[PDB]
């Protein structure tokens, strides 16, 4: 299911909480903002330095119908003065490379190997479909046969401003089989 060119970093591992020391009981979990067949996780108002920071903001994308476009917005470093100076997105090669769970850890996977037939176009609205442009997007196929769960990280917890720390953003995309 993989061709002769695609490689990932098999050494890479992280966790959902990262370095924040926040347990999963304490995550702020919420649903993605869904308009028609577009499901959106927008982190531009979730990750700025706050008094209680770092918190974990976990955006849940739950899919069980065909042709869902999933869109993830992660604020760019320097898009606001100071407030995202140390923000990091993982994987750097999102959405082509995603994170999946391997024995409590998060490791790299190819999204194309996870979901047969999905759309990952190189550009969306004449901009490269990569978090260096601030937003990624993929569209799920009419038929999914295999269940999958995968993750993206948009972490601002190392940004500090006036004795406040930013938050760590998590996207969890839950795809249940459909269209059989």
């Amino acid at each position, epitope marked *: 299911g993989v*061709d002769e*060119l695609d490689k990932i970093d098999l050494s890479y591992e992280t966790t959902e909480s990262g370095d924040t020391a926040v347990s999963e009981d304490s995550y702020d979990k919420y649903a993605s903002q869904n308009t028609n067949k577009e499901y959106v996780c927008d982190f531009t108002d979730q990750l700025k330095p706050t008094e209680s920071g770092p918190k974990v903001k976990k955006c849940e994308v739950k899919v069980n119908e065909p042709l869902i476009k999933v869109k993830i917005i992660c604020p760019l470093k320097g898009s606001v003065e100071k407030l995202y100076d140390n923000i990091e997105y993982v994987p750097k090669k999102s959405p082509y*490379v995603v994170l999946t769970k391997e024995e409590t850890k998060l490791k790299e996977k190819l999204l194309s190997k996870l979901i047969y037939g999905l759309l990952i*176009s190189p550009t969306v609205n004449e901009k*490269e479909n990569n978090f260096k442009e601030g937003v990624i997007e*993929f569209t799920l*196929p009419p038929v999914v046969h295999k269940a999958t769960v995968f993750y993206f990280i948009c972490d601002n917890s190392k940004t500090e401003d006036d004795n406040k720390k930013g938050n760590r953003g998590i996207v969890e995309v839950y795809v249940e089989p459909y269209g059989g």
Partner: antibody
Amino acid sequence: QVQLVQSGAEVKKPGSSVKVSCKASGGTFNSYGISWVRQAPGQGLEWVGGIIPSFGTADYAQKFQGRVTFTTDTSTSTAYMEVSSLRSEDTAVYYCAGSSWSSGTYYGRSAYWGQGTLVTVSS
Amino acid sequence: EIVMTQSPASLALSLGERATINCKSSQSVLYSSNNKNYLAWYQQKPGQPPKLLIYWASTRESGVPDRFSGSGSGTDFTLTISSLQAGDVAVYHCQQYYSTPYSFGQGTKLEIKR
């Protein structure tokens, strides 16, 4: 042994409409991206548009806006291209091509080509 | 829209020589999230549809001999045919499939100089 077989050549009146069929043998095209590509006499290849039959979505070159419609009959695994308001300049061999899916695109490997359909626009 | 351009328009070389066909895109077709160039090469013999030779700029289709080689990255690409044979006479086309509208080069006609 996937094979694309197209409908026969025809002359069509200026201003009329033509519908070209393209039937896949060796199975369905439900995981394929279908492209339509034309070649005018003496010219290079020109992308007309494409459709992914699974997705029901179609793309068209700006030159063909409001004039070209792509459809599929998944029952018979046949793709159709309808070109209306035909102009003298539309005289060309029209090819359908199919590409299997890989790496997030339906158009990375257009290896299956129909034999071509010559549409002559003439009175 | 991405403009594709090939050079030379025509090539006449002797048997056994090396043919070099260049293709330039007006914008990069390299996607940084998978490091792939969205670039294909086709061979078209007279009376026949185009036949896919190279895809992802450098991957050979099944059955294509190793004398056919695609190279380049970003905006500049090259099809190289080593040790030219009499059956290689054809028009060669490059195509980008990076973004719609998909577009082709103008074609390069290759002939054998006896």
